[PDB]
Amino acid sequence: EGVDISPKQDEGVLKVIKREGTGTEMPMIGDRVFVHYTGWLLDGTKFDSSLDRKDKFSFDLGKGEVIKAWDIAIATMKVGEVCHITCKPEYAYGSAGSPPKIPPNATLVFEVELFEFKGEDLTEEEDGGIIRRIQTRGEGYAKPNEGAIVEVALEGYYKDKLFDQRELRFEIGEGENLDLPYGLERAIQRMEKGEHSIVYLKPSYAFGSVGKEKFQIPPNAELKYELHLKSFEKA
């Protein structure tokens, strides 16, 4: 019925906006998202919803945790948006389907409401110390380990102000000598080859209480780094 939002443009995913959202942004790849849904086969013989749960239905965008359609559809939504998505079998379950639930070559339709989306917490303890927003997915799945040699492009911001900008080759576990905050080294260890990302650092994972005098960074400071991972050697 509505706008074709399939990347290939084959009318595979159709979207009608039932209620307009708020704000300019949409979730990007790797972001965790929070929705409520109601879904049905085009014929309307089986029904499903997330509404029965106290908590929102949630997953990570782009990682293939849901039907291709959702990975596509949600990356077009805004906060508070309510929409209707029609999903041709190509972008859902295709030839075989998923017996017993979903019959062969079924088109699916969803009502989806996006409540919340947030970057990935990279900290082992999930304390919100390191948050990543992916700009460009990298090709690879391998990641650096402690002692690896990396080629990075990095740009540090304090209160939206650039203080550090370099293209360097260094060793994981030796960033301190090159004035790189600990959280950054830990963020790199989570990136893939060719990944462009924005990384948010709370003071604890930044320069902490000491600050960094030469970068005009006060003690106890939130840092935004925008960094690119070119290539690397594991050791």
CA distance 14 to 69: 9
Q: Find the helix or strand (DSSP H, E) in which 62 lies.
A: none
Q: Which of 47, 55, 141, 160 is catalytic?
A: 47
Q: How was this structure determined?
A: X-ray
110 given a catalytic annotation: yes
215 given a catalytic annotation: no
Q: Find the helix or strand (DSSP H, E) in which 202 lies.
A: none
67 given a catalytic annotation: yes
Q: Which of 110, 117, 205, 225 is catalytic?
A: 110
Q: What is the dihedral of CA 141, 147, 150, 154, to 10 degrees?
A: 100
37 given a catalytic annotation: yes
Q: Residues of 12-26 as b/e, b for ≥16 C-beta within 10 angstroms? A: bbbbeeeeebeeeeb
Q: Which of 17, 29, 48, 60 is catalytic?
A: 48
Within the chain, residue ranges assigned H as helices are: 68-74, 182-188
Q: Which of 91, 93, 225, 232 is catalytic?
A: 93
CA distance 154 to 92: 39
Complete domains list, the chain, with CATH: 1-119 (3.10.50.40), 120-235 (3.10.50.40)
205 given a catalytic annotation: no
What is residue 214's DSSP assignment? G
